[PDB]
Symmetry: C2
Amino acid sequence: SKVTTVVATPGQGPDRPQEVSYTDTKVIGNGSFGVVYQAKLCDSGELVAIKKVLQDKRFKNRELQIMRKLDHCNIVRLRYFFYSSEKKDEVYLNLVLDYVPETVYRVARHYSRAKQTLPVIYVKLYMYQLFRSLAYIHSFGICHRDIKPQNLLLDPDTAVLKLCDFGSAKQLVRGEPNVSYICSRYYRAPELIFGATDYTSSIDVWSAGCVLAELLLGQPIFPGDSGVDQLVEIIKVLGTPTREQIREMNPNYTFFPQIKAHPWTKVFRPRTPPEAIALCSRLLEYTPTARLTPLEACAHSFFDELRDPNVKLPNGRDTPALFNFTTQELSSNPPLATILIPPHARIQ
Amino acid sequence: SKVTTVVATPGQGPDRPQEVSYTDTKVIGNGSFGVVYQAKLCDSGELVAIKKVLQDKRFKNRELQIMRKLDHCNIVRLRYFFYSSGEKKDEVYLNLVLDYVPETVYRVARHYSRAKQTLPVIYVKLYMYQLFRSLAYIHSFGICHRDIKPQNLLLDPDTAVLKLCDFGSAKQLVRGEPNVSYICSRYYRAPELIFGATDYTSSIDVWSAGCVLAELLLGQPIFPGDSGVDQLVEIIKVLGTPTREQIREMNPNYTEFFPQIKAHPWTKVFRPRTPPEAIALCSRLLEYTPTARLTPLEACAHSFFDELRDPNVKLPNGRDTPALFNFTTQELSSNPPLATILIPPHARI
């Protein structure tokens, strides 16, 4: 019906302002993040999400900066941003971004409502693309600081997963301190609950750990209404941290209920693939530097089936691009290439 | 059913174990707070709640220690405790025989919310007051609950009595000593907690209490959010941005790092027929500055609670109001001249 038309700056690429018209402007969601719209680009008829948020004239926008720095097959792409005008006499920043139909959250709640669970394949596929996105933003030393099921968008038909909502990501700098009160309750890592401030990008690795667990498990692995509740669940599985391990998370704790390290194998449903639990235990480690790196985790047995050249989706379609590893991603440790890129994908 | 006979040490009193015999052990609930059963005492036929938790010898049970010091109309009474071996083999459980109370403020408030109804201010008034007595009392011992939330406020719908409960997070707060910043349920955390400060004080509880107040008026949590950021926003939306002092006064070293949202007026927040009184009290508990917050006793003496100091105040069900005025010195320790307000003309003669 009514068609809107703006002048916007393209996301990556040089300020060459463009006319952008769109229509069919359903609200998707809204809250802390901002307000998110579905929208249909006039031209192509393509669907896009638009994230309208408040802009402080004082500062430049942190998410925006990041987003423009970022181009990756598993991260929603900013396409245009642009300013505009709920709250009169003040200015809105609008990110026009890829739109994706489902979210890992929705999807796993669907399976859970139905007491069933996710074909393991569909997990691997997702977990892997997630580790790719982490591997890649981490190579700018950027940290999402909010990996949760709700922030992982799925294309159900193509199985493409895209990491999204960077309203929270920050480029971590060594010896600079950052707020410990980020990240979503359940996916907070030990050191965060222990209120640390010198945490590294490896908190993303812990969150992903809980995402994997939660998909394997039907339900969040470290639930808790309070920090303590969570710690107990974490302890009940890892076992009591040690003085050594606690110095690792947060020194200023060098205040503890003495429990034995419960065998992982008894935490997961019975026919849970062994390789998967192996993965988990190497992601969810008390010691931040002991956890796998995103890239080390991509290159792990649990993902071995993704490298089989025969691998297809249940709907018999092809798996998305899995091995097109820009030098950038590989940057954190390039010898891993040999594994990440299976013989059959180095063929002429 | 089965009858069970342990030998148990009385909660207060001397330290003299005795045979205690109970039966009918339905299982109220269980989470981090260990298990909580319910059961009927053979002697009094009375109902109790047993809280069974795991015990190390590697330390005295902090909760037990506290419970034994506590006698108030508005705090669950520890009646006995005793040890046993239960679910874990060669593992040792401490059991806490405690007053059983039929309802919780969570449960009630939900009914009302579902129903789209809103809890009659008389009840918000009674519950809140009683809450505030129980804090006043515990804080006089410099004990701090550290987990004030509707789930942990029990009620007897009938007698209208609120009793504060669950003390596994309660710790006595000593000055210049540090305490873990990861106590308190999601929605009810004081800002300084969200900033991981460890220099916090009993006030964390007054914030958690003003949260319960707000909820009972609003009909839902006042500062919701699945992350510390989301809540901190929610709060800023209401209290405006912290000054730099306000900030240095919670956690000192978050001086750097904030959106400059103006304060959306307190009035502007509540349904329009909300008693001014209520909001005024709210604004006084939900302060950034820990020191600027009302004290529990200071709060009972607030104009909001005036309806209760009336002589012909009576419950909706027609019964009269519970012990509101049995203040002991102890309780009033923080500020005695309040007594002339807290205790009205008619009470206690």
